[model samples]
Target: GSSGSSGKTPIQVLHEYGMKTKNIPVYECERSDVQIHVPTFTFRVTVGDITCTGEGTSKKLAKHRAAEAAINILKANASGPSSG
Candidate 1:
């Protein structure tokens, strides 16, 4: 488990990074469903041209997962130039 000193969620951290990098993170609900007594959702977030998907039991969780995925992708890209 990880915690931010400023108590920001993963999505918030990603948003701040986007503001500083000028990449601008955008999120969308790609899919959602309510089955039995529980709800599930899938979300996609794009930063620049990069996009990632995440699924969770709640919209907020889905968004956070998507943001976390986007952050990992962006960090990977920063490590080197893409071949494609």
Candidate 2:
């Protein structure tokens, strides 16, 4: 799991990816010092022009973050059918 150098948020990442897919975005949230016991690990996803948010309470935020990062990179670097 990895984050991007630009440090764009999940939403931003989705937008960059064109957000025009029919799939779901994957996200993982972590516990912040501001709050505890609030599910340190949260995973959500967005896809295909849709802005939806899902959540998971696993210690896989990094993984989720990496996926999002990859999407953004692909969007920025890849050019394929909008129906992928």
Candidate 3:
């Protein structure tokens, strides 16, 4: 058999895209250099709730973009009994 390699990880792709470290959310920016213990995330389930909420962080405060990204991520992976 022959050995092969995969492309860069998401974080690597982020950096390669000229997305400055400052543009990454704060928690993500801080955690970028560290290995992610739980790459996935979870939220509290509440009755009658149709959406999940999350905060964004970056080296700098790209609040709007960060917030949108956060929302998109939660929306993309929303599963189980709570997803709308």
Q: Each candidate's TM vs. the true structure?
A: 0.73, 0.29, 0.23
lDDT, candidate 3, equals 0.34
- Candidate with maximal TM-score: 1
Per-residue C-alpha lDDT of model 2 across residues 1-84, encoded as one tens digit per residue: 677655666555554555564444554343323255644444434344323323343344544554565575555756356564
- The deviation in Å at residue 84 for candidate 2 is 15
Worst 10-residue lDDT window, candidate 2 = 49-58
Ranking by TM-score: 1, 2, 3
Residue 46 accuracy (lDDT) in model 1 = 84
For model 3, the run of ten residues with the poorest summed lDDT: 40-49
lDDT of each residue in 16-41, candidate 1, tens digit only: 88888777788777778888566777
Candidate 2: regions farther than 4 A off = 1-7, 16-36, 40-42, 49-79, 82-84
Best by lDDT: 1
Cα TM-score of candidate 2: 0.29
C-alpha RMSD values across all candidates: 4.7, 9.0, 12.8
Residue lDDT tens for model 3, 1-84: 668966543333433332432333232322333235334222221112223222332322333343444434434644235456
Question: Number of clashing residue pairs in every model?
Answer: 0, 18, 4
